C-alpha cells in the first residue's frame, strides 16, 4: 500500500462489490475493476513489465474477507522471494487492508456529520443526543488516525530504510537475500502479527469491531430523524388533524432518551476496551513508541 493514490481509488470501486457475500463473487469480474484503477490513478505511468504480474487472488464470509493482491513472480527473480516472502506479504497485506477500511469508514462517518447538521439544525431537542454521536467519533478517529502514523513512520519508513541501506552497499546476492529476509522479520514483529504477541492482536480486533457497531448504530439514529423531519415537512406544506400528530410528535420526543442510553453504553464500553488495550502494550521495544502516540496529552491514564 505504499502508493496511497492507487489504493484510494481502488477502495472506492470495490465498495459496491465486496458488500455482497463471497458466494456470488467470481474472480473474472474484479480484474476489470483493478485494470480500471491502474488506468485512472498515477500508477499508469509505470513499467509495463511489473504491471504484467500485478493481479488479484481470492482467499478461501464477505467480500472484505477474501480479496487480496498477489503479484506472482517466477523465474530468476524467484530465488529472492522463494515462496516464503510471498507467504509473508499476504500475511502482512491483511493487516494493512483492515487498517485501511477501518479508516475510510471513519472518514465516511465524519463526512456524514458535515452534511447531517446542515439539514436538521432546526430541531433543538435532538442536538442533545446528536452530540454524543460526534464526541464518540472524534474520540474513535484519533485511535485510528494515530495508528496509521505508527504504520507509516515507525514500521514502513523506518524498517525499509535499513533495507535500502544494506542493498546499495551489499553484493554477491547473498547479502541481499539476508537483508531482505530480515526486512520481513521486523515488519512481522513491529506489526502485531507475531506468534507470542497473539493476546495483543485479538485485543485490537475488538476495537476494530466497535468502529463497525457505531456505523450501524449511527444511521439507525440518523435515518430515524430524517423520516420524522420529512413527515414534518409535508405535514405543513400542503395545509399551509392538529391533535392526532402531537401524540406522534410527543412520542417521538419520548423515544430520544432510549437512543441516548445506547450511545451512553456504547461509549462506556469503547473506553473500557482501549484502556485495557494500553495495559497490554507494557509487555518488544518499538511498541513503546506506539503507547506515546495514543496517550498524547494523557487523555487516558487519568
Amino acid at each position: 500500500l505504499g502508493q496511497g493514490d492507487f489504493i484510494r481509488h481502488l477502495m472506492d470501486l470495490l465498495k459496491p462489490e465486496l458488500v455482497r457475500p463471497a458466494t456470488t463473487l467470481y474472480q473474472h469480474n474484479l480484474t476489470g475493476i483493478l485494470e480500471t484503477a491502474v488506468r485512472a490513478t498515477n500508477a499508469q505511468f509505470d513499467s509495463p513489465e511489473i504491471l504484467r504480474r500485478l493481479d488479484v487472488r481470492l482467499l478461501e464470509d464477505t467480500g472484505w474477507d477474501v480479496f487480496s493482491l498477489d503479484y506472482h513472480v517466477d523465474g530468476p527473480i524467484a530465488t529472492v522471494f522463494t515462496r516464503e516472502c510471498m507467504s509473508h506479504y499476504l500475511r502482512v497485506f491483511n493487516f494493512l487492508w483492515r487498517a485501511k477500511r477501518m479508516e475510510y469508514i471513519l472518514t465516511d462517518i465524519r463526512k456524514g456529520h458535515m452534511c447531517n447538521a446542515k439539514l436538521l439544525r432546526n430541531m433543538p431537542e435532538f442536538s442533545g443526543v446528536l452530540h454524543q454521536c460526534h464526541i464518540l467519533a472524534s474520540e474513535m478517529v484519533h485511535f485510528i488516525h494515530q495508528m496509521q502514523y505508527y504504520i507509516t513512520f515507525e514500521v514502513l519508513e523506518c524498517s525499509w530504510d535499513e533495507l535500502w541501506n544494506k542493498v546499495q552497499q551489499a553484493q554477491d546476492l547473498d547479502h541481499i537475500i539476508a537483508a531482505h529476509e530480515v526486512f520481513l522479520d521486523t515488519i512481522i514483529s513491529r506489526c502485531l502479527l507475531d506468534s507470542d504477541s497473539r493476546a495483543l492482536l485479538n485485543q485490537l480486533r475488538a476495537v476494530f469491531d466497535q468502529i463497525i457497531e457505531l456505523q450501524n448504530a449511527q444511521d439507525a439514529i440518523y435515518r430515524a430523524a430524517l423520516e420524522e423531519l420529512q413527515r414534518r415537512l409535508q405535514f405543513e406544506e400542503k395545509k399551509k388533524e392538529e391533535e392526532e400528530e402531537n401524540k406522534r410528535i410527543g412520542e417521538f420526543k419520548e423515544s430520544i432518551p432510549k437512543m441516548c442510553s445506547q450511545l451512553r453504553i456504547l461509549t462506556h464500553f469503547y473506553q473500557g476496551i482501549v484502556q485495557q488495550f494500553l495495559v497490554l502494550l507494557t509487555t518488544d521495544e518499538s511498541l513503546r513508541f506506539l503507547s506515546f502516540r495514543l496517550d498524547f496529552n494523557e487523555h487516558y491514564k487519568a
Binding site: 500500500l1 505504499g2 502508493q3 496511497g4 493514490d5 484510494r8 485512472a40 498515477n42 471513519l106 472518514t107 465524519r110 463526512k111 456529520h113 458535515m114 452534511c115 447531517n116 447538521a117 446542515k118 439539514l119 439544525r121 442533545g128 452530540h131 454524543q132 460526534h134 464526541i135 467519533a137 472524534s138 474520540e139 478517529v141 484519533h142 485511535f143 488516525h145 494515530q146 496509521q148 502514523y149 504504520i151 507509516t152 513512520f153 515507525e154 514502513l156 519508513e157 523506518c158 530504510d161 513508541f289 506515546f292 502516540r293 495514543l294 496517550d295 498524547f296 496529552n297 487523555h299 487516558y300
Partner: protein, 370 residues
C-alpha cells in the same frame, strides 16, 4: 477526485491568480499552459493542461498578464446581484462539475472584509449547500460598514462551510514590517500564496496517508461547530528545530486556552527516523497544551519538494484563541449598533456568532460535553 476552486472579489481573484502562478511554477507547466520537458500527481487541480478555476476589472489585468492562455461596497448589494445572476453563473458551475469524473469539494478564496465578494460568497455558499449536499466546502477566507459585512460572512460561514482557514491582513502586515521591511498587496500576497500552496501539498505529492481532502479535514475538526483553523509557516536543521519554531506565537498568522488538533507538514529531505524522538521531547518539555475532555494528539506528515523548483514546514492548528478575533468584530458591531425593511438578519447574525463564541469559550472546559 477533483477539486474545483472559485475566486470572488478583487482580493480573492488576486490571491487565486498568484496561487495558480505558484502552482504552475511548482510543476513543469509554462505560462502558455503547455507542459515543459525538464511523479507529481497533477490531475486533482488540472484538467488534461487547464486549471479548474471559475473567476468572478482585475480580470482584464489577468488577461493582459502573460498567463492569458491559462483560462458597490455593501453586503446587501452583493447578495442582490448574486441572486440576479444565479442561473448564469450556475450553468458554468454545473457544466464544470458534471464535466469532472468525481467531484470532491469547492475551494472558495474571498475576502470577507467588505465589498461585493462578501455577499456574493454568502449567496454562493447558501446555494451550494442547497444543491450539492455531498460536497465538502473549504474556504480560504481573508480577515481585515466593514463590521457588518464581516459578521454577516461569519454568520453564513459557521453553518455552511464544512471547514475554514482564517487569514488576517493585520498579522500579515506585522510580519511584513518585521521580517520583510516593506515600510503592499503584491508583497503580502506572496506569503499568502506560499501558505496556500503549502496547504495542499500532501494532495499533489502522494504519500502514505492524506490522499484526499477528508483525510485532512476529519482528523482536525472533531465536531461540526469547531471548524476554524489557523496557519503557521516557520521558514522565512532537524525536525525538532522546525517543530520548536512552529509552536512559537511569533510565526502564527493570528493577532484559559488550549489546542484541539495540530497537523505538521514537512517538505524537506530530513531523516524520517527522528520525528518520533521530536514528538517525545515535545511531550517531555510540555510546550503545548491540549483539551482536557477528549484525547487529542498532534499529527505529522512528510512530503517532497518540487524538484523543478532546503527544509521547510507548515502547521495547521485548531486553537480556541481564534474566537478572540470574532469578539472584536462583535464588539465593533455593538459600537456600530448604538451610533448609526426589517433589519433583523443582522440581529440573527449577531445571535449565531454569539452562540459560536460561547461554544468556543465552553470548549476549553473539562466538562465541555453537555
Amino acid at each position: 477526485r477533483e477539486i474545483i476552486t472559485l475566486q470572488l472579489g478583487q482580493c480573492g481573484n488576486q490571491i487565486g491568480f498568484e496561487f495558480w502562478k505558484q502552482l504552475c511554477a511548482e510543476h513543469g507547466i509554462s505560462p502558455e499552459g503547455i507542459v515543459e520537458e525538464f511523479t507529481d500527481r497533477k490531475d486533482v487541480f488540472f484538467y488534461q493542461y487547464i486549471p479548474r478555476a471559475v473567476l468572478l476589472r482585475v480580470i482584464h489585468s489577468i488577461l493582459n498578464s502573460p498567463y492569458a492562455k491559462l483560462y458597490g461596497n455593501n453586503w446587501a448589494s452583493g447578495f442582490s446581484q448574486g441572486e440576479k445572476i444565479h442561473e448564469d453563473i450556475f450553468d458554468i458551475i454545473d457544466r464544470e462539475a458534471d464535466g469532472s469524473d468525481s467531484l470532491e469539494g469547492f475551494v472558495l478564496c474571498h475576502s470577507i472584509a467588505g465589498g461585493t465578494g462578501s455577499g456574493l460568497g454568502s449567496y454562493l455558499l447558501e446555494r451550494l449547500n442547497d444543491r450539492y449536499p455531498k460536497k465538502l466546502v473549504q474556504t480560504y477566507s481573508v480577515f481585515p460598514v466593514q463590521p457588518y459585512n464581516s459578521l454577516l460572512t461569519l454568520k453564513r460561514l459557521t453553518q455552511n462551510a464544512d471547514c475554514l482557514v482564517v487569514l488576517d491582513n493585520t498579522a500579515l502586515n506585522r510580519i511584513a514590517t518585521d521580517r520583510l521591511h516593506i515600510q503592499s498587496f503584491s508583497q503580502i500576497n506572496q506569503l499568502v500564496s506560499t501558505i496556500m500552496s503549502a496547504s495542499t501539498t500532501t494532495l499533489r505529492y502522494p504519500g502514505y496517508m492524506n490522499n484526499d481532502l477528508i483525510g485532512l479535514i476529519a482528523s482536525l475538526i472533531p465536531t461540526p461547530r469547531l471548524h476554524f483553523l489557523m496557519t503557521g509557516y516557520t521558514p522565512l536543521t532537524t525536525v525538532l528545530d522546525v517543530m520548536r519554531r512552529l509552536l512559537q506565537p511569533k510565526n502564527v498568522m493570528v493577532s484559559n486556552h488550549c489546542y484541539i488538533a495540530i497537523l505538521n507538514i514537512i517538505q524537506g529531505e530530513v531523516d524520517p527516523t527522528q520525528v518520533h524522538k521530536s514528538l517525545q521531547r515535545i511531550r517531555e518539555r510540555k510546550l503545548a497544551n491540549f483539551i482536557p475532555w477528549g484525547p487529542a494528539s498532534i499529527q505529522v506528515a512528510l512530503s517532497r519538494k518540487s524538484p523543478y523548483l532546503r527544509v521547510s514546514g507548515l502547521m495547521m492548528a485548531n486553537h480556541t484563541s481564534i474566537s478572540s478575533l470574532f469578539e472584536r468584530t462583535c464588539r465593533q458591531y455593538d459600537k456600530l449598533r448604538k451610533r448609526e425593511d426589517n433589519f433583523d438578519e443582522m440581529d440573527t447574525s449577531r445571535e449565531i456568532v454569539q452562540q459560536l463564541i460561547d461554544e468556543y469559550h465552553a470548549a476549553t472546559r473539562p466538562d465541555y460535553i453537555s
